[PDB]
């Protein structure tokens, strides 16, 4: 089974994260499937929009696969590390992207949403960046995108406390576009895609590029955030505390941090 | 007939777009009227604020004049292309600007609100950026300003779908400052102006310059947005879709 | 007595401006105590967060001590107002706004990561009413932290926002009832200090674009603020402002 599925619904490509038994956590196989489907969407002029969703009724994406992290397995597209987490977060394409958040969207899952142009969410879905609670950071763009997409103070609380945010509160803040009845997020996301795909495709695509400040394929304003994220990650990996998140979980206990 | 009228109410200059039969659509005449007025406002120390509004009871500004566009007419101020659309959107002045939106404010009209410092709207007013439905884009600043002034996701849905936004919803998001009773927008805008003109003018003007990041009359942070809008728009006018979009009337896009 | 106090509550440093009789107005002694405490917070691995608050229950901070003499940290003028507003530290900061916060206190709130406020508190930048501007970061930060149009009204009118309205816009995190603002800030502090401190601290640095203890994106804001203040400080209007308040009369501005 591939880590993600891709199918066409008219002029929309639907990409589905396909690891429901692992709460659709992202590993390399997910990145290969999502990444390859996004690139097929970019080069097919018949595709006018993309929807990203998770298999089943429980999870959009629970985050980075923590068992893969403990096993020192790379999470990204083996052929395209430049596409970032899930082959998705640093993978600009011209076509509009919509996250159809069907359930739990925590950590990496919320970062998939931030990376998408638009978000529709099941009313039961929960958002958040709990990475800091287990000695990680939101390295898949979360750390510099959350304050671009939420008011500064609201973004900082979320980032520094790691506490979750309901779909309703996300929508109230303008972090997501709409909250829908349980079970209906895919149809709602296709209806949003149609409200876009009827428009002149070159116009929509020029609009997207200008709105993100894209020059020759690259979101140039994001580069300092990625560079700082990489720089920080390297110091964190060396720390004693870097051992403690996994160690605490393994020993069925609360972590005791040393700030070293 | 002049494309825009300018007059004084005390220490406020009121600029009125004056093509109500064309729903206050912007052409070169409007850009000349609005632009000359702003420059006069900039250089008269007695003018402490400016209010922009549209003639009549139905339209603030319907957008770029589509018949002018179809005839390949230049829409801007002939002597000041660098001021941009309506001689307004890239024409920074030190005096505070308030859009008094008396009605329809679509495309170019929403771009005039974005470019203004404050917005007070008639409850009937509609905002939106429908350029993408017509094979064009919001080239007068809208494509990069809308995501600066609304939450990213909200701005993005407005930009990509082209669908309108009510005045009430615009206020709820903080895109405009107030929504007022039908017919009252000009008086509301003047009352707001006086809450500003009572203050020390050099103070108000310095705060405006710091808040927008102005060095030598240029909003430094907007220049990449303009550069990208210009290069994208060049290619886009060469496409068939950019001709197919107007002249309808349900268009057929070939993505070319 | 010292201008501000610093005390530990577990892994939180509480910094209290210690001048209740003066409404906690900032002078040099305050800047010394606040600045020194932040620096102790920065270098002590046990301090995982910082709460800033005012002594007593009437005032968070009244602003610059109107009986002004330097007000900054004599050894660290680069930290700016109260040794606080241009003094990045790795540890998250929570303003516990326990009373009035017009002007300077709003600038301390803008500088902090998080804000908990008394429902009585008001947030505003009334400096434009007296001939000067919010020079302790307020002008450029208010537009970063409120929606553009809402920030511009606040800045140009000099009128206050209620704590509740500030919370509705996302400018502050929490509004509580008088007497328990510090309790509510410590509860917020604990929701952060429970987490891995190096991850929290790295997240803060990235979120603000920090390279070697400097918020690089703020520097043009500081530079423009100082440039503008230099012209404001010589103007006849900046004399007319306090001269008028003093004499119980309306000021007459010349825009010079």
XYZ file of C-alpha atoms in Angstrom:
772
model
C 0.000 0.000 0.000
C 1.395 3.411 -0.972
C 1.684 5.995 1.808
C -0.692 8.268 -0.137
C -3.338 7.853 -2.824
C -4.056 10.199 -5.713
C -7.258 10.260 -7.739
C -9.032 12.663 -10.040
C -12.466 14.128 -9.404
C -12.997 16.104 -12.629
C -10.350 18.845 -12.700
C -9.402 18.325 -9.000
C -6.700 15.985 -7.757
C -7.469 14.450 -4.395
C -4.431 13.289 -2.477
C -5.239 11.061 0.515
C -2.747 10.254 3.306
C -3.048 6.451 3.571
C -1.882 5.254 6.996
C -5.048 5.209 9.097
C -3.591 2.492 11.342
C -0.849 5.010 12.262
C -3.282 7.989 12.529
C -1.968 9.162 9.166
C 1.403 10.146 10.667
C 3.919 11.175 7.994
C 6.804 8.947 7.023
C 8.885 8.664 3.850
C 6.203 6.580 2.089
C 3.624 9.336 2.739
C 6.087 11.925 1.369
C 6.714 9.931 -1.791
C 2.956 9.649 -2.496
C 2.018 13.253 -1.606
C 5.116 14.744 -3.237
C 4.755 12.801 -6.503
C 1.035 13.599 -6.730
C 1.679 17.340 -6.196
C 4.273 17.322 -8.958
C 1.876 15.455 -11.294
C -0.768 18.104 -10.433
C 1.611 20.974 -11.342
C 2.398 19.659 -14.813
C -1.093 18.487 -15.793
C -2.996 21.541 -17.158
C -6.237 19.532 -16.799
C -5.760 19.666 -12.988
C -6.970 23.049 -11.732
C -6.911 22.443 -7.938
C -5.623 19.953 -5.322
C -7.293 18.587 -2.180
C -5.243 16.963 0.570
C -7.028 14.752 3.101
C -6.463 11.740 5.377
C -7.918 8.224 5.069
C -10.747 7.321 7.438
C -12.929 9.231 9.918
C -10.389 9.739 12.789
C -7.208 11.490 11.581
C -6.139 14.068 9.033
C -2.562 13.663 10.257
C -1.397 13.058 13.825
C 2.080 14.498 13.166
C 5.517 13.272 12.220
C 5.831 9.504 12.722
C 7.522 9.252 16.109
C 8.487 5.578 15.711
C 10.317 6.568 12.484
C 12.097 9.366 14.366
C 13.191 6.925 17.099
C 14.459 4.570 14.369
C 16.486 7.349 12.690
C 14.519 6.936 9.448
C 14.242 10.014 7.231
C 10.631 11.218 6.947
C 10.863 13.111 3.677
C 10.796 12.225 -0.022
C 14.074 10.291 -0.531
C 14.546 11.940 -3.984
C 13.329 15.418 -2.954
C 14.464 16.603 0.479
C 13.898 20.176 -0.768
C 10.123 19.530 -0.738
C 10.261 19.274 3.078
C 7.876 17.418 5.382
C 5.428 15.122 3.531
C 6.804 16.227 0.149
C 4.408 19.080 0.756
C 5.385 21.951 3.095
C 8.195 23.295 0.926
C 6.689 22.278 -2.383
C 5.156 25.270 -4.066
C 2.912 24.551 -6.990
C 0.903 27.006 -9.092
C -2.381 25.187 -8.530
C -4.501 26.074 -5.455
C -4.268 23.608 -2.565
C -7.011 22.850 -0.046
C -6.640 20.857 3.177
C -9.766 18.834 3.942
C -9.080 18.228 7.577
C -11.171 15.191 8.401
C -10.009 14.767 11.990
C -6.954 15.102 14.227
C -4.436 17.568 12.728
C -1.657 17.947 15.298
C 1.939 19.074 14.881
C 2.957 18.156 11.335
C -0.763 17.845 10.605
C -1.362 21.479 11.523
C 1.762 22.312 9.485
C 0.221 20.675 6.404
C -2.775 22.957 6.930
C -0.537 26.081 7.295
C 1.293 25.082 4.111
C -1.988 24.785 2.162
C -3.708 27.736 0.454
C -7.052 27.002 2.074
C -8.443 24.758 4.800
C -11.805 23.182 5.387
C -12.269 21.166 8.556
C -14.574 18.663 10.153
C -16.077 20.199 13.309
C -14.471 17.403 15.400
C -10.947 18.176 14.135
C -8.327 19.522 16.536
C -5.367 21.691 15.532
C -2.161 22.442 17.459
C 1.625 22.400 17.640
C 2.429 20.147 20.633
C 5.985 19.502 19.458
C 7.401 21.470 22.420
C 5.737 19.049 24.884
C 7.957 16.206 23.668
C 11.238 18.048 23.102
C 10.695 18.695 19.356
C 9.890 21.889 17.456
C 7.474 22.616 14.584
C 10.270 22.295 12.074
C 7.978 21.713 9.076
C 7.232 25.486 8.845
C 5.041 25.762 11.935
C 7.503 27.898 13.913
C 7.553 30.770 11.386
C 4.156 30.248 9.650
C 1.875 30.222 12.720
C 2.489 33.954 13.443
C 2.007 34.783 9.750
C -1.432 33.177 9.807
C -2.723 34.010 13.329
C -2.466 37.177 15.343
C 0.975 37.438 16.958
C -0.121 36.890 20.561
C -2.542 34.045 19.685
C 0.161 32.395 17.554
C 2.771 32.665 20.348
C 0.483 31.083 22.990
C -0.167 28.124 20.681
C 3.513 27.729 19.799
C 4.896 28.069 23.330
C 2.199 26.168 25.316
C 1.703 23.355 22.740
C -1.977 23.284 23.670
C -4.603 22.438 21.052
C -7.159 24.634 19.257
C -10.644 23.490 18.205
C -11.718 23.703 14.560
C -14.304 26.354 15.601
C -11.695 28.540 17.290
C -9.347 28.069 14.318
C -12.142 29.282 12.006
C -13.049 32.188 14.336
C -9.430 33.379 14.185
C -9.258 33.055 10.386
C -6.622 30.301 10.525
C -9.043 28.082 8.588
C -11.776 28.897 6.076
C -14.678 26.741 7.171
C -15.992 24.264 9.701
C -18.440 21.634 8.483
C -20.666 18.878 9.857
C -18.954 15.667 10.933
C -18.202 13.449 7.964
C -18.690 16.060 5.228
C -15.241 17.701 4.859
C -14.302 16.144 1.489
C -17.499 17.277 -0.280
C -17.164 20.732 1.323
C -13.555 20.923 0.078
C -14.535 19.880 -3.465
C -17.264 22.545 -3.436
C -14.580 25.130 -2.492
C -12.292 23.805 -5.229
C -15.132 24.313 -7.775
C -15.557 27.926 -6.665
C -11.908 28.342 -7.744
C -11.557 26.078 -10.785
C -14.328 27.941 -12.707
C -12.036 30.966 -12.685
C -9.402 31.677 -15.347
C -6.575 29.330 -14.369
C -3.712 31.622 -15.395
C -5.223 34.426 -13.278
C -5.657 32.193 -10.207
C -2.110 30.964 -10.584
C -0.560 34.413 -11.110
C -2.556 35.546 -8.019
C -1.123 32.758 -5.907
C 2.460 33.480 -6.986
C 2.173 37.197 -6.170
C 0.410 36.567 -2.843
C 3.272 34.370 -1.538
C 6.048 36.374 -3.279
C 7.197 33.570 -5.548
C 10.212 34.139 -7.813
C 11.386 31.336 -10.126
C 9.565 28.652 -8.062
C 10.667 29.774 -4.575
C 8.716 31.487 -1.808
C 11.589 33.896 -1.114
C 10.191 35.306 2.146
C 10.175 31.782 3.686
C 13.879 31.165 3.163
C 15.080 32.955 6.290
C 12.569 30.914 8.348
C 13.772 27.616 6.894
C 17.428 28.640 7.362
C 16.835 29.556 11.034
C 14.799 26.404 11.583
C 17.707 24.288 10.258
C 20.263 26.252 12.302
C 18.279 25.753 15.563
C 17.540 22.043 14.938
C 21.262 21.308 14.892
C 21.828 22.754 18.408
C 18.717 20.992 19.776
C 19.809 17.544 18.482
C 23.031 17.710 20.506
C 21.266 18.514 23.820
C 20.792 16.163 26.794
C 17.070 17.079 26.748
C 16.884 15.714 23.176
C 17.291 12.252 24.767
C 14.566 12.829 27.391
C 11.351 13.167 25.338
C 11.683 9.673 23.827
C 13.217 8.304 27.075
C 10.255 9.569 29.160
C 7.633 8.180 26.763
C 9.421 4.796 26.708
C 9.420 4.685 30.554
C 5.693 5.581 30.862
C 6.447 8.788 32.807
C 6.515 12.597 32.685
C 9.808 14.074 31.361
C 12.241 15.915 33.656
C 13.872 18.645 31.526
C 17.340 20.072 32.344
C 17.544 22.948 29.764
C 20.818 21.429 28.560
C -16.582 66.525 -17.143
C -13.777 66.027 -14.587
C -13.348 62.408 -13.517
C -13.236 63.407 -9.830
C -14.264 66.409 -7.748
C -12.256 67.885 -4.863
C -13.515 70.169 -2.086
C -12.900 71.201 1.551
C -14.877 70.479 4.709
C -12.779 72.447 7.194
C -9.327 70.869 7.426
C -10.498 67.773 5.481
C -10.262 67.384 1.699
C -13.143 65.352 0.201
C -12.325 63.702 -3.133
C -15.386 62.366 -5.006
C -15.064 59.973 -7.953
C -17.502 61.477 -10.497
C -18.658 58.892 -13.064
C -21.854 57.677 -11.454
C -23.405 56.593 -14.827
C -20.422 54.224 -15.223
C -20.737 53.164 -11.525
C -17.661 55.263 -10.649
C -15.353 52.991 -12.689
C -11.816 54.313 -12.942
C -10.466 55.704 -16.160
C -7.690 58.208 -16.943
C -9.982 61.172 -16.157
C -10.613 59.793 -12.648
C -6.889 59.144 -12.104
C -6.137 62.753 -13.081
C -8.800 64.144 -10.731
C -7.971 61.907 -7.768
C -4.206 62.159 -8.210
C -4.017 65.948 -8.554
C -6.244 66.224 -5.460
C -3.977 63.942 -3.385
C -0.897 65.913 -4.409
C -2.653 69.161 -3.506
C -3.609 67.566 -0.190
C 0.022 66.544 0.399
C 1.369 70.096 -0.017
C -1.315 72.096 1.811
C -0.563 72.127 5.591
C -4.219 73.128 6.240
C -5.386 69.763 4.880
C -5.043 67.423 7.865
C -6.971 64.476 6.309
C -8.484 63.207 3.086
C -11.740 61.371 2.450
C -12.302 59.492 -0.824
C -15.877 58.653 -1.852
C -18.060 58.081 -4.946
C -20.817 60.312 -6.393
C -24.329 59.050 -5.751
C -26.023 56.393 -3.659
C -25.119 53.070 -5.313
C -21.425 52.915 -6.169
C -18.110 53.753 -4.468
C -16.138 52.233 -7.370
C -17.172 49.306 -9.629
C -13.533 48.679 -10.621
C -11.337 49.361 -13.610
C -13.507 50.614 -16.468
C -14.014 47.531 -18.624
C -14.809 49.448 -21.840
C -11.606 51.456 -21.431
C -9.748 48.149 -20.925
C -11.391 46.577 -24.011
C -10.278 49.596 -26.092
C -6.705 49.290 -24.668
C -7.017 52.806 -23.175
C -4.422 53.709 -20.493
C -6.291 53.989 -17.160
C -3.715 55.870 -15.095
C -2.627 59.510 -14.726
C -0.814 60.310 -18.040
C 1.770 62.508 -16.276
C 2.096 60.131 -13.253
C 2.050 56.442 -14.187
C 4.034 55.757 -11.002
C 1.004 56.759 -8.847
C -0.739 53.672 -10.270
C -4.466 52.960 -10.501
C -6.769 55.984 -9.960
C -3.589 57.987 -9.310
C -4.166 56.617 -5.768
C -2.908 53.092 -5.020
C 0.835 53.887 -5.292
C 0.625 57.550 -4.325
C 1.684 57.709 -0.705
C 0.877 61.000 1.048
C 1.524 62.119 4.601
C -2.118 63.005 5.303
C -4.394 60.201 6.579
C -6.823 58.785 4.041
C -10.288 57.448 4.682
C -12.345 55.512 2.156
C -15.979 56.502 2.598
C -17.507 53.514 0.771
C -21.060 54.497 -0.198
C -21.862 51.337 -2.195
C -20.316 48.846 -4.642
C -16.557 48.585 -4.056
C -15.399 45.689 -6.260
C -12.031 44.911 -7.837
C -10.350 48.276 -8.320
C -12.805 49.635 -5.734
C -11.673 47.232 -3.058
C -8.102 48.104 -4.079
C -8.824 51.787 -3.256
C -10.009 50.704 0.226
C -6.882 48.588 0.770
C -4.699 51.539 -0.267
C -6.516 53.864 2.145
C -5.558 54.166 5.823
C -9.091 53.713 7.159
C -12.464 52.569 5.780
C -16.010 53.412 6.767
C -18.704 51.633 4.730
C -22.386 51.989 3.977
C -24.150 48.776 5.122
C -25.090 48.111 1.468
C -21.437 48.117 0.383
C -19.955 44.992 -1.189
C -16.249 44.323 -1.352
C -14.384 41.713 -3.417
C -11.686 40.905 -5.989
C -13.503 39.304 -8.951
C -10.675 39.913 -11.460
C -9.873 36.178 -11.608
C -13.386 35.497 -12.994
C -12.579 37.791 -15.940
C -9.117 36.500 -16.914
C -7.331 39.416 -15.205
C -5.834 39.936 -11.712
C -6.065 42.516 -8.966
C -3.170 44.477 -10.421
C -3.734 47.718 -8.415
C -2.216 46.253 -5.228
C -4.963 43.852 -4.224
C -3.082 40.621 -4.890
C -0.364 41.479 -2.303
C -2.314 43.841 0.040
C -5.323 41.631 0.707
C -3.198 39.025 2.622
C -1.521 41.878 4.559
C -4.865 43.213 5.795
C -6.940 40.056 6.396
C -5.954 36.707 7.856
C -3.977 34.826 5.239
C -6.542 32.054 4.766
C -9.459 34.528 4.530
C -7.520 36.724 2.064
C -6.642 33.677 -0.015
C -10.260 32.516 -0.413
C -11.307 36.058 -1.503
C -8.425 36.189 -4.007
C -8.767 32.722 -5.574
C -12.589 32.394 -5.728
C -13.290 35.986 -6.668
C -16.414 35.970 -4.517
C -17.727 39.062 -2.778
C -17.481 39.974 0.900
C -20.257 41.932 2.692
C -19.528 45.130 4.588
C -20.517 43.477 7.889
C -18.107 40.580 7.280
C -15.349 43.029 6.236
C -15.753 44.818 9.584
C -15.816 41.522 11.526
C -12.420 40.627 10.042
C -11.014 44.109 10.627
C -10.573 44.921 6.938
C -12.685 48.055 7.429
C -13.241 50.153 10.524
C -17.002 50.709 10.612
C -20.317 49.941 8.973
C -22.976 52.637 9.115
C -26.578 53.331 8.179
C -27.532 53.687 4.520
C -26.799 57.173 3.171
C -24.637 58.231 6.113
C -21.140 57.132 5.048
C -19.739 60.562 4.161
C -20.835 62.079 7.491
C -19.496 59.025 9.341
C -16.161 59.390 7.506
C -15.991 63.078 8.401
C -16.632 62.342 12.100
C -13.809 59.770 11.996
C -11.585 62.316 10.251
C -12.129 64.798 13.118
C -11.070 62.192 15.657
C -7.788 62.410 13.714
C -7.549 66.103 12.714
C -7.824 67.199 16.359
C -4.382 65.591 16.912
C -0.968 67.156 16.247
C -0.516 66.814 12.462
C 3.227 66.130 12.392
C 2.656 63.378 14.991
C -0.121 61.765 12.971
C 1.931 62.055 9.817
C 5.100 60.570 11.390
C 3.092 57.648 12.764
C 1.680 57.002 9.327
C 5.221 56.930 7.857
C 6.675 54.565 10.474
C 3.643 52.202 10.369
C 3.950 51.717 6.609
C 7.757 51.712 6.505
C 8.115 54.840 4.360
C 11.506 56.133 3.233
C 11.362 59.188 0.922
C 7.671 58.832 0.056
C 8.035 55.151 -0.903
C 6.388 52.285 0.928
C 9.546 50.240 0.775
C 7.927 46.900 1.610
C 5.400 47.153 -1.276
C 7.986 47.352 -4.067
C 8.485 43.613 -4.495
C 4.705 43.205 -4.658
C 4.509 45.834 -7.402
C 7.448 44.323 -9.297
C 5.788 40.875 -9.242
C 2.369 42.264 -10.164
C 3.951 44.068 -13.141
C 5.863 41.059 -14.517
C 2.900 38.663 -14.038
C 0.474 41.143 -15.643
C 2.700 41.525 -18.723
C 2.499 37.821 -19.568
C -1.167 37.635 -18.580
C -2.330 40.328 -21.062
C -0.684 38.251 -23.852
C -2.939 35.267 -23.074
C -6.136 34.529 -25.029
C -7.978 33.989 -21.710
C -7.397 37.691 -20.919
C -9.463 38.525 -24.042
C -11.998 35.679 -23.643
C -12.798 36.711 -20.036
C -14.325 40.064 -20.924
C -16.667 39.696 -23.912
C -18.505 37.198 -21.707
C -21.412 37.395 -21.580
C -19.936 31.886 -19.495
C -16.221 31.937 -20.610
C -14.137 28.968 -21.839
C -10.566 28.809 -20.492
C -7.739 27.128 -22.423
C -5.122 27.948 -19.738
C -3.341 29.948 -22.446
C 13.469 51.298 47.291
C 14.538 49.545 44.083
C 12.650 50.635 40.941
C 11.618 47.068 40.217
C 11.799 43.766 42.046
C 12.660 40.313 40.766
C 11.544 37.098 42.507
C 11.328 33.420 41.705
C 8.145 31.378 41.830
C 9.337 27.907 40.871
C 10.769 28.227 37.361
C 9.091 31.624 36.712
C 10.742 34.979 37.299
C 8.250 37.637 38.377
C 9.476 41.190 37.700
C 7.405 43.823 39.511
C 7.657 47.521 38.712
C 7.951 48.869 42.227
C 6.675 52.483 42.183
C 2.942 52.318 43.108
C 2.859 55.861 44.554
C 4.059 57.129 41.175
C 1.525 54.893 39.363
C 4.509 52.687 38.367
C 5.851 55.343 35.997
C 9.199 54.339 34.487
C 12.393 56.074 35.559
C 16.056 54.994 35.426
C 15.784 52.917 38.576
C 12.870 50.961 37.047
C 14.935 50.427 33.869
C 17.842 49.199 35.926
C 15.729 46.681 37.871
C 13.710 45.434 34.899
C 16.698 45.216 32.533
C 18.962 43.555 35.097
C 16.254 41.008 35.975
C 15.688 40.091 32.304
C 19.367 39.524 31.933
C 19.402 37.266 35.035
C 16.407 35.413 33.506
C 18.365 34.947 30.251
C 21.426 33.344 31.906
C 19.694 31.220 34.579
C 18.766 27.776 33.150
C 16.087 27.338 35.855
C 14.125 30.389 34.666
C 11.811 29.044 31.966
C 9.488 32.097 31.724
C 9.115 35.681 32.855
C 6.121 37.631 34.060
C 6.152 41.435 34.123
C 3.634 43.260 36.271
C 3.108 46.448 38.307
C 2.942 46.777 42.097
C -0.533 47.247 43.573
C -3.886 47.170 41.815
C -4.421 50.568 40.144
C -1.606 50.793 37.569
C 0.515 48.454 35.411
C 2.576 51.331 34.129
C 1.647 55.025 33.803
C 4.301 55.593 31.104
C 7.457 57.685 31.187
C 7.713 59.457 34.549
C 6.364 62.939 33.614
C 8.711 64.412 36.232
C 11.536 63.390 33.874
C 16.923 63.191 33.675
C 17.352 59.896 31.797
C 14.735 57.113 31.957
C 16.687 54.266 30.300
C 19.179 51.791 31.803
C 22.351 53.907 32.183
C 24.575 50.950 31.219
C 22.237 49.683 28.479
C 20.425 52.423 26.528
C 20.167 49.966 23.615
C 17.454 48.116 25.613
C 15.213 51.181 25.304
C 12.229 51.968 27.504
C 12.265 50.289 30.926
C 15.241 48.151 29.872
C 12.529 46.068 28.277
C 11.175 46.976 24.839
C 14.400 46.327 22.874
C 15.801 43.560 25.030
C 15.185 40.160 23.513
C 15.685 37.199 25.783
C 15.250 33.515 25.100
C 12.731 33.019 27.869
C 9.069 33.728 27.089
C 7.657 36.942 28.587
C 4.135 37.559 29.846
C 2.841 41.032 30.600
C 0.433 40.938 33.571
C -1.359 44.235 32.988
C -2.858 44.961 36.391
C -4.344 48.402 35.648
C -3.981 51.413 33.337
C -1.611 50.876 30.394
C -2.072 53.847 28.055
C 1.088 54.599 26.056
C 4.160 53.137 27.745
C 2.303 50.200 29.293
C 0.849 49.320 25.887
C 4.389 49.388 24.539
C 5.514 46.955 27.249
C 2.594 44.695 26.288
C 3.549 44.908 22.568
C 7.153 43.985 23.454
C 6.121 40.922 25.494
C 5.295 37.504 24.026
C 1.989 37.112 25.781
C -0.405 39.391 27.642
C -2.904 38.845 30.441
C -4.930 41.929 31.411
C -7.372 43.311 33.957
C -10.779 43.991 32.292
C -10.317 47.649 33.480
C -7.138 48.038 31.422
C -7.105 50.050 28.211
C -4.545 49.758 25.439
C -3.666 52.777 23.376
C -1.034 55.123 22.039
C -2.310 58.645 22.885
C 1.089 60.285 22.180
C -0.220 61.772 18.882
C -2.518 63.971 20.999
C 0.495 65.781 22.613
C 2.848 66.332 19.629
C 5.106 63.268 19.832
C 4.741 59.570 18.921
C 4.901 56.084 20.463
C 8.712 55.893 20.400
C 9.121 52.720 22.519
C 8.227 50.385 19.628
C 4.495 51.107 19.604
C 4.134 52.587 16.139
C 5.681 49.772 14.144
C 4.533 46.936 16.491
C 0.842 47.872 16.710
C 0.463 47.323 12.931
C 2.201 43.909 13.282
C -0.075 42.779 16.131
C -3.521 44.145 15.164
C -5.193 43.956 11.781
C -3.874 46.836 9.668
C -7.066 48.979 9.577
C -7.713 48.541 13.315
C -4.070 49.362 14.138
C -4.202 52.483 11.935
C -7.307 53.813 13.718
C -5.638 53.261 17.093
C -2.442 54.987 15.976
C -3.953 57.971 14.170
C -6.786 58.843 16.572
C -4.761 58.073 19.706
C -7.933 56.552 21.176
C -7.857 53.509 23.497
C -8.971 49.901 22.983
C -10.688 48.080 25.893
C -8.994 44.966 27.272
C -11.973 42.920 25.982
C -11.677 44.418 22.470
C -7.900 43.876 22.513
C -8.593 40.233 23.359
C -11.216 39.973 20.560
C -8.662 41.103 17.990
C -5.942 38.761 19.305
C -3.700 41.564 20.644
C -3.766 40.069 24.149
C -4.411 36.502 25.263
C -6.563 36.757 28.362
C -8.811 39.163 30.251
C -9.447 38.580 33.950
C -11.099 40.391 36.853
C -9.203 42.864 39.092
C -6.872 41.320 41.711
C -6.099 37.999 39.989
C -4.136 39.165 36.886
C -0.860 37.901 38.367
C -2.470 34.528 39.248
C -3.725 34.224 35.664
C -0.297 35.119 34.249
C 1.446 32.501 36.429
C -1.074 29.860 35.260
C -0.223 30.813 31.680
C 3.476 30.772 32.561
C 3.095 27.195 33.915
C 1.503 25.994 30.697
C 4.822 27.019 29.022
C 7.351 26.088 31.703
C 6.083 22.473 31.715
C 7.431 22.082 28.171
C 10.973 21.332 26.987
C 12.680 24.711 27.565
C 15.218 24.501 24.693
C 12.415 23.735 22.201
C 10.226 26.547 23.560
C 13.154 28.949 23.402
C 14.241 27.911 19.896
C 10.598 28.315 18.805
C 10.552 31.863 20.176
C 13.773 32.811 18.338
C 12.514 31.446 14.998
C 9.035 32.988 15.411
C 10.619 36.462 15.774
C 13.430 36.006 13.182
C 16.183 36.306 15.785
C 19.842 36.246 14.733
C 22.309 36.606 17.654
C 19.848 38.039 20.146
C 18.546 40.629 17.654
C 15.030 40.783 16.214
C 16.325 41.711 12.745
C 12.910 42.694 11.349
C 12.467 45.352 14.077
C 15.625 47.315 13.182
C 14.070 49.348 10.322
C 11.208 50.174 12.757
C 13.619 51.438 15.368
C 15.586 53.438 12.777
C 12.501 55.128 11.301
C 11.158 55.843 14.782
C 14.367 57.656 15.822
C 14.566 59.588 12.558
C 10.999 60.818 12.972
C 11.418 61.634 16.671
C 14.364 63.901 15.908
C 12.142 66.248 13.829
C 9.229 65.948 16.243
C 11.427 66.904 19.254
C 12.336 70.330 17.733
C 8.844 71.235 16.506
C 6.790 74.130 17.895
C 3.788 71.726 18.098
C 5.598 69.423 20.588
C 5.889 72.506 22.841
C 2.232 73.491 22.248
C 0.935 70.061 23.378
C 2.079 69.984 27.039
C 1.824 73.803 27.255
C -1.915 73.478 26.437
C -2.743 70.594 28.802
C -1.027 72.594 31.547
C -3.121 75.727 30.857
C -6.477 73.813 30.639
C -7.151 74.725 26.987
C -7.334 73.328 23.429
C -3.999 73.258 21.507
C -3.563 75.188 18.243
C -1.386 73.287 15.782
C 0.816 74.917 13.095
C 2.204 71.628 11.641
C 5.719 72.903 12.358
